[PDB]
Amino acid sequence: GMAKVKIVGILNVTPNSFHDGGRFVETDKAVVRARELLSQGADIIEIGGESTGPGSNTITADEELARIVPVIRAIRSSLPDANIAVDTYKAEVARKALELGATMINDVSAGRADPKLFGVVARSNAQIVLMYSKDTDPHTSFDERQYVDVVRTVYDFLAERKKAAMSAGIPADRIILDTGLGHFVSSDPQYSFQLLAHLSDFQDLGCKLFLSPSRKSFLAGNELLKTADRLPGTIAASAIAVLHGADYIRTHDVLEVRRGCEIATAINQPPER
Amino acid sequence: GMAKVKIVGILNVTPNSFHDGGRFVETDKAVVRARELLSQGADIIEIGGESTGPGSNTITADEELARIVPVIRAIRSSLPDANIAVDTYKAEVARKALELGATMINDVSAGRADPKLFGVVARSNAQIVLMYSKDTDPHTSFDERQYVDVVRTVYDFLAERKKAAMSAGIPADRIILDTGLGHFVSSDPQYSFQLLAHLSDFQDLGCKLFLSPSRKSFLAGNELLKTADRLPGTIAASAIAVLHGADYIRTHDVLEVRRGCEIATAINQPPER
Ligand SMILES: Nc1nc2ncc(COP(=O)(O)OP(=O)(O)O)nc2c(=O)[nH]1
Ligand SMILES: Nc1nc2ncc(COP(=O)(O)OP(=O)(O)O)nc2c(=O)[nH]1
Ligand SMILES: [Cl-]
Ligand SMILES: [Cl-]
Ligand SMILES: [Cl-]
Ligand SMILES: [Cl-]
Ligand SMILES: [Cl-]
Ligand SMILES: [Cl-]
């Protein structure tokens, strides 16, 4: 029987008032959202303290740890079975995250931002998700980047990042590959669609596949739909991704995306003979 | 550029009180639903007066025409551009439907229930949709029918129904094939999934493909979801169907299914070179 896709629930820690204090309130609400993520069917709770999309702000390592360290401590204290991923590109944030018990590190830079992040992951058993980004900056930008063949560019990029991660001590069975979607690839939505169509081409690299459509820009369509109207598109994009080899789906709509991806897994399942 | 999938909006005419009178009220509401179907993006309005799923009731031809004849007359009077399909298996209902201006006839029996339906369609330019059904009765039944290979059984069935429709005078470019889904195939949901997986195998028959996941039984999943919770599953099933060759998608959720299927069409679209 074909195994299910693992749903990665998103849990971003963004302070209400970015002044001093009031973080105890923000930690309490983050545990509430994490419990609802689990109750909707999420297999992994991805805690991140720094947004990396276009228009996002760069935050220091001290501020990043100030946001996620209380959250990880609270979740692993009351929900010790829940597997936790941490969305970070700093080696210092990853080190403290792995000490607390995080089992996965999502690096939007694919180890490029902090040269010491690869080794910190290697000295553990944590898995790492290398995502393709059109920019060296982990904070992607609004740019209608064009490609002669986006599939070859992303394939060759992830191939050399996997080699760089293996040379740092991370085995291939602990490396997860993310072709990137939306603005990370291009503000031209055609290239996110082409990557979804040829997702199975990346399985030759021998690593589990990680994708996050999650109401991104490329799901706007001809109607120029905004975020509130992208749920049908993100269900279809995530389902077709699972049909084309995606092992992880990172989304904000855990309940609906899991139920849609469950249909894709059932379509991929041959009969019981 | 790859053409879009044509969304078929469902419009069932079921009397409120099945007594005498009050049909003028039911005709007025049916035009309202038809306008909303068009405004959500439906390309065809499918008007049917007889449900054919399990537990449905068999109605006479006089009653069937009593329900749909005022509806078709009202829609084609105020919305003369709207293309109209009629869900019927009776040659008499199809004849009156084609005279009023219907451009498509959806026959759940694939011409088996009324031997004269094929010829009535042939004396017109209307397209016909032949759907596979496990039962000779157009009203399908609750039955966990098993198959050695459901794909071969449905393929050979549609192949001989197409030959029977061509021998009756209907050209191949006016024949649309529906493998059937849900209870029409089997109350065992595995076979609807296997048909979706191998939908592209039916393109060898040389006809446009017609599918209607539309919150059927097989989308219940392990959670045993009921109809209200099947919208994510029906978006994923319809999108994967379009990815696998479906030219028509018949649904109740026109707005969401069209937006999800639009993502599938964009994934199927190769770059502009
Ligand atoms: N591995 C991976 N990580 C990511 N992190 C952030 C975002 C930003 O996308 P978005 O859907 O807007 O999520 P958020 O609202 O948390 O920024 N996308 C990815 C992604 O696509 N892949
Ligand atoms: N060609 C075709 N015709 C059909 N007519 C009725 C139903 C019944 O399915 P359902 O989703 O329950 O629609 P309704 O609520 O109108 O009965 N399904 C099909 C179908 O799958 N294919
Ligand atoms: Cl290039
Ligand atoms: Cl390649
Ligand atoms: Cl956006
Ligand atoms: Cl059999
Ligand atoms: Cl076959
Ligand atoms: Cl049902």
Query: Looking at chain B, how many residues does it have?
Result: 273
Instruction: Give the separation between CA B252 and CA B36, rounded to whole angstroms.
Output: 11
Resolution to 1 decimal place, in Å? 2.8
Q: Do strands B6-12 and B248-251 pair parallel, antiparallel, or not at all (unpaired)? A: parallel
The single-letter DSSP state of residue B3 is P
For residues A94 and A88, give the distance between their C-alpha atoms in angstroms, rounded to a whole number. 7
Token code pair at residue B223: 């959670």
Sign of the CA dihedral A129, A132, A138, A143? negative
Query: CA-to-CA distance for B246 and B21, rounded, in angstroms?
Result: 41
Measured from the Cβ of residue A265, the count of other Cβ atoms closer than 10 Å reads: 18
Work out the minimum CA distance from A209 to partner chain B, whole angstroms: 18
Distance from CA of B68 to the nearest CA of A (A): 32
Residue B210: partners with Cβ closer than 8 Å, 6 or more residues away? B8, B106, B129, B131, B176, B177, B178, B246, B247, B248, B250
Residue of B196, B267, B269 to mutate, testing the A interface (most A Cβ within 10 Å of its Cβ): B267
Helical (H) or strand (E) element with B29:
helix B23-40
- Residues with Cβ within 8 Å of residue A253, at least 6 apart in sequence: A214, A215, A231, A234, A235
Of the partner residues A194, A196, A232, the one whose CB lies closest to the CB of residue B271:
A194
Q: Which of A190, A237, A262 is opposite residue B221, by nearest beta carbon? A: A262
For residue B227, count other CB atoms closer than 10 A to its CB.
Answer: 14
Count of helix runs (H) and strand runs (E) in chain A: 8, 8
CB B190 to CB A236 under 8 A?
Answer: no
How far, CA to CA in Å, does B191 sit from each of A254, A265, B150? Answer: 27, 14, 6
B190-225 exposure pattern, b = at least 16 Cβ within 10 A, e = fewer: bbbbbbbbbbebbeeeebbbbbbbbbbbbbbbeeeb
Tokens 């003979």 sit on residue: A273
What radius of gyration, in Å, describes the C-alpha atoms of chain A? 18
B214 CA → ligand 5 middle, Å: 30
Between CA A182 and CA B252 the distance in angstroms is 30
Closest CA to B12 of B53, B40, B41: B53
CA-CA distance, A267 to B263, in Å (whole number)? 18
Nearest CA in chain B to A198: B267
A55 burial (CB, 10 Å; 0-12 / 13-18 / 19+) is exposed
CA B88 to chain centre: 10
Please give the torsion angle defined by the CA atoms of residues B248, B251, B256 and B261, in that order, rounded to the nearest 10 degrees. Answer: -20
Query: Residue A9 and residue A213: Cα distance in Å, rounded?
Result: 13
The structure tokens listed for A97 are 């995250």
Q: What is the DSSP string of A112-165?
A: SS-TTHHHHHHTS--EEEEE--SSSSSS--------S-HHHHHHHHHHHHHHHH
Burial class of residue A212 in the structure, from the number of CB atoms within 10 Å of its CB (0-12 exposed, 13-18 middle, 19+ buried): buried
10 Å CB burial of residue B133 (0-12, 13-18, 19+) is buried
Distance CA(A272)–CA(B4), nearest Å, equals 34
- Could you give the CA distance from residue B117 to residue A125 in angstroms, rounded to a whole number? 67
List chain B gaps (C–N > 2.5 A) by preceding residue.
none
Asked if A195 contacts A163 with a C-beta cutoff of 8 angstroms, the reply is: no
Residues of the domain holding B183: 1-273
Find the helix packing angle between A190-197 and B254-268, rounded to 10°: 80
Could you give the number of structural domains in chain A? 1
**Which chain B residues have a beta carbon less than 8 Å from that of A263?**
193, 219, 221, 232-233, 236-237, 240
